[PDB]
């Protein structure tokens, strides 16, 4: 039956992408946190 994850690449990038994060003071602080933790990816992969 139809499940919760229905991949689409435009969505993924349009939504969790770098430019998106940067757009919003909330998301700029996501990058800040992930960078401080030293995440390898700051941002989901997509493609």
Binding interface with Mg ion (CB under 5 A): 10, 40
User: Cβ 18 to RNA, closest distance in Å?
Assistant: 12
Instruction: Put residue 5 in one of left, alpha, beta given phi > 0 → left and psi -120 to 50 → alpha.
Output: beta
Q: In the bound complex, which residue of the shown chain has the CB atom lying closest to Mg ion?
A: 10
Q: Say how far apart CA 47 and CA 39 lie, in whole Å.
A: 19
Per CB under 7 A, 11 contacts RNA: yes
What span, in angstroms and rounded, lies between the C-alpha atoms of 20 and 1? 32
Contacting residues toward RNA, per CB under 7 A: 1-12, 15-16, 20-21, 24-27, 30, 37-41, 44, 47
């Amino acid at each position: 039956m139809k499940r919760t994850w229905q991949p689409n690449r435009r969505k993924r990038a349009k939504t969790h992408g770098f430019r998106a994060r940067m757009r919003t003071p909330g998301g700029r602080k996501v990058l800040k946190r992930r960078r401080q933790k030293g995440r390898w990816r700051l941002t989901p992969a997509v493609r």
